[PDB]
Amino acid sequence: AALDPAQPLAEAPPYSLFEAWAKPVQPFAIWPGVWYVGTENLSSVLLTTPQGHILIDAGLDASAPQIRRNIEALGFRMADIRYIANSHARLDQAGGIARLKAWSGARVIASHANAEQMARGGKEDFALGDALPFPPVTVDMEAQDGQQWHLGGVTLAAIFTPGHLPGATSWKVTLADGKTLIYADSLATPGYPLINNRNYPTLVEDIRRSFARLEAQQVDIFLANKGERFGLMDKMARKARGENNAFIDKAGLARYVAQSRAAFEKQLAAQRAQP
Secondary structure (H helix, E strand, O other): OOOOOOOOOOOOOOHHHHHHHOOEOOOEEEEOOEEEOOEOOEOOEEEOOOOOEEEEOOOOHHHHHHHHHHHHHOOOOHHHEEEEEOOOOOHHHHOOHHHHHHHHOOEEEEEHHHHHHHHOOOOOEOOOEOOOOOOOOOOOEEEOOOOEEEEOOEEEEEEEOOOOOOOOEEEEEEOOOOOEEEEEOOOOOOOOOOOOOOOOOOHHHHHHHHHHHHHOOOOOEEEEOEHHHHOHHHHHHHHHHOOOOOOEOOOHHHHHHHHHHHHHHHHHHHHHOOO
């Protein structure tokens, strides 16, 4: 939407921060049928199935060739990716979707608000304005909360978790083996003007509802859009060394919400107390 000229914007993080987070890592398996093909801190998760694959998120546009190489290094084909699902429509997660869509022929799945922002190539961000644009994408299938997709025994379900952005979306995956997985979107509000933000007036009520939404979900494997939030690098090394169940963490999601809640309320409390 058009931004209110009376509403101050947050300062975007420097692109150098995303570049550091985009440092490549060797792709690896989180669990049978579940592959990590992202970077050190920008998550991208491939779900493989006998009827095609699902990719969650795509990193920076500059990372697109590396993600394709990671997918190919594991032995899979871009042409077999049927869906690309997006958590939130900023360059850190959607920057490479345009190129990965072109390379795969997949259909992109995203919430309406993420679809609108992706069509704008990241511009008119309620918090960042036009600070960090990326290649525009036309979402093929707009997701609504609770909607489900089925592919070769895998179920992909949208869990709306607004706050980081109005369209921020978490994803619940049910594998054919019965194991469950949540890919949690960010709950962070770095540099955000939180209180009565004219570009996003329901922000704090939304993010508090997103806490409870994720807290009401119980799964086996906790993943997030940012590696640091679920111990990606530590778990990756442990599993390579022999810890098959390194990413099994039934309390992981609840722990993430508790941490995110405490961090958010601490920031909001400081802004509320501003003289």
